[PDB]
């Protein structure tokens, strides 16, 4: 029922990305939390090879499967690239992926 020190440090890097807010308090995390089902957006699953969202990321961290931080980063990094593939470069999701990308990386250097 407990959480390894590595788990507690993956939760921290996870939570900072989720809770990041822009200059007038919007949470960029919102659109990325969870994808609509295959039945509700087949185009996404037919155009993006390996679909990723944050609660799916959450289910492996809280459950067990990340050996270090950069292991979790690559599913985050992967998720963003998916968003930036499916959405056009000037789209909002696209830039929020970009901004959150740096947050993830700004957080990890802080160890
Ligand atoms: O790449 C992604 N793209 C989208 N979501 C995501 C949610 C979690 C992870 C990736 C993505 C939310 C759906 C959304 C894209 N959005 C779908 C409706 C039409 C406008 C674009």
Swiss-Prot record:
Widely expressed. The modification Phosphoserine is found at residue 37. There is a cross-link at residue 1 (Glycyl lysine isopeptide (Lys-Gly) (interchain with G-Cter in SUMO2)). It comes from the Eukaryota. It is found in: Nucleus. Residues 1-111 form the Bromo domain. It is linked to Renal cell carcinoma: Renal cell carcinoma is a heterogeneous group of sporadic or hereditary carcinoma derived from cells of the proximal renal tubular epithelium. It is subclassified into clear cell renal carcinoma (non-papillary carcinoma), papillary renal cell carcinoma, chromophobe renal cell carcinoma, collecting duct carcinoma with medullary carcinoma of the kidney, and unclassified renal cell carcinoma. Clear cell renal cell carcinoma is the most common subtype. Component of the SWI/SNF-B (PBAF) chromatin remodeling complex, at least composed of SMARCA4/BRG1, SMARCB1/BAF47/SNF5, ACTL6A/BAF53A or ACTL6B/BAF53B, SMARCE1/BAF57, SMARCD1/BAF60A, SMARCD2/BAF60B, perhaps SMARCD3/BAF60C, SMARCC1/BAF155, SMARCC2/BAF170, PBRM1/BAF180, ARID2/BAF200 and actin. Interacts with PHF10/BAF45A. Interacts with acetylated 'Lys-14' of histone H3 (H3K14ac), and may also interact with other acetylated or methylated Lys residues on histone H3. Involved in transcriptional activation and repression of select genes by chromatin remodeling (alteration of DNA-nucleosome topology). Required for the stability of the SWI/SNF chromatin remodeling complex SWI/SNF-B (PBAF). Acts as a negative regulator of cell proliferation. This is Protein polybromo-1. The chain holds residues 653 to 763 of 1689 of the full protein.
């Amino acid at each position: 029922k407990y959480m390894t020190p590595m788990q507690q440090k993956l939760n921290e890097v996870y939570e900072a990305v989720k809770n990041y807010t822009d200059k007038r308090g919007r949470r960029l995390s919102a659109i990325f939390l969870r994808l609509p089902s295959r039945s509700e957006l087949p185009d996404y699953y037919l155009t993006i090879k390996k679909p990723m969202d944050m609660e799916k990321i959450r289910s492996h961290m809280m459950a067990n499967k990340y050996q270090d931080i950069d292991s979790m980063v690559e599913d985050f990094v992967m998720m963003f690239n998916n968003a930036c593939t499916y959405n056009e470069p000037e789209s909002l999701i696209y830039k929020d992926a970009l901004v959150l990308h740096k947050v993830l990386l700004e957080t990890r250097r802080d160890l």
